[PDB]
């Protein structure tokens, strides 16, 4: 019912001018609330050889309401489900208009670095992580190779 909020315009600009490390985010040309995102797998994680695709959407009441985000790259992780949905406190109970898109993306990046199978979203993956951690990590690295874009 209006032009794009300045808050979103400025965040969008700064995601390009002042990017966060290993992360890219840019809106679709035809929908400026809808972002194509990539996150590099963190070094010394099972995901480290890959670049992961995500998509994010800004609801109408942003920044009073949290962004929506999920992985498009298939990924093996106890806190990411088979549809790419992410269990993150900053997207629910700890959201605040003091936070930004880049906050959410950094928090996803850190989740890749510290899986938590004891508070899981994908219970099947969490079970594997708990009973066979080294096997689960190997599978995550295999899925990185199979489904994620390869870092140069």
């Amino acid at each position: 019912m209006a032009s794009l909020p300045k808050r979103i315009i400025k965040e969008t600009e700064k995601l390009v001018s002042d990017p966060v490390p290993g992360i890219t985010a840019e809106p679709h040309d035809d929908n400026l609330r809808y972002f194509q995102v990539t996150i590099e797998g963190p070094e010394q994680s099972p995901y480290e050889d890959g670049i992961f695709e995500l998509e994010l959407y800004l609801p109408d009441d942003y920044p009073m309401e949290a962004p929506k985000v999920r992985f498009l790259t298939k990924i093996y992780h106890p806190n990411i489900d088979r549809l790419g949905r992410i269990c993150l406190d900053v997207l629910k109970t700890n959201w605040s208009p003091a936070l930004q898109i880049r906050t959410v993306l950094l928090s996803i990046q850190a989740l890749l670095a510290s899986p938590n199978p004891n508070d899981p979203l994908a219970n099947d993956v969490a079970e594997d992580w708990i009973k066979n951690e080294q096997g689960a990590k190997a599978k995550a690295r295999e899925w990185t190779k199979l489904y994620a874009k390869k870092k140069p």
Binding site: M1, R33, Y34, Y57, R70, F71
Partner: protein, 137 residues
């Protein structure tokens, strides 16, 4: 202006069921629980009472293509049914069925399943002979 894109519209539809909301008479979820594109859905219509659909259930496939919900989904019954808008050899719901013919972006798979159930309950349709439960197209 302010358009929720396909993937997040599909997530909205998915999470409505997951939270326990929705009508008593029909339901839907993913056909492949790991289909990240969320293209293929599976629906259930409970047959309307006082009819030859009573105490029957009908399973359907709903294909939400790349232009959903601007374009209608494609709907095919799995459970065999005798219903004029259902092609009797393929189980496809014909595109002249009103919900599809006049599809609007606001419509959801819920809208579509509810309209199909209503079609089952019209005076002319409720008396059609039905195939044996368990038969599929």
């Amino acid at each position: 202006m302010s358009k929720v894109p396909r993937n997040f519209r599909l997530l909205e539809e998915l999470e409505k069921g997951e939270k326990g909301f929705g009508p008593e008479s029909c339901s839907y979820g993913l056909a492949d629980s790991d289909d990240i594109t969320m293209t293929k859905w599976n629906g259930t219509i409970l047959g309307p009472p006082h009819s030859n659909h009573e105490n029957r259930i009908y399973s359907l496939s709903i294909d939400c293509g790349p232009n959903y919900p601007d374009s209608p989904p494609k709907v095919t019954f799995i459970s065999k049914i005798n219903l004029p808008c259902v092609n009797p050899t393929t189980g496809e719901v014909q595109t002249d069925f009103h919900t599809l013919r006049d599809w609007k972006r606001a419509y959801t798979m819920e809208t579509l399943l509810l309209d199909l159930r209503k079609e089952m309950a019209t005076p002319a349709n409720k008396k059609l002979r039905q195939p044996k439960e368990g038969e599929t197209f």
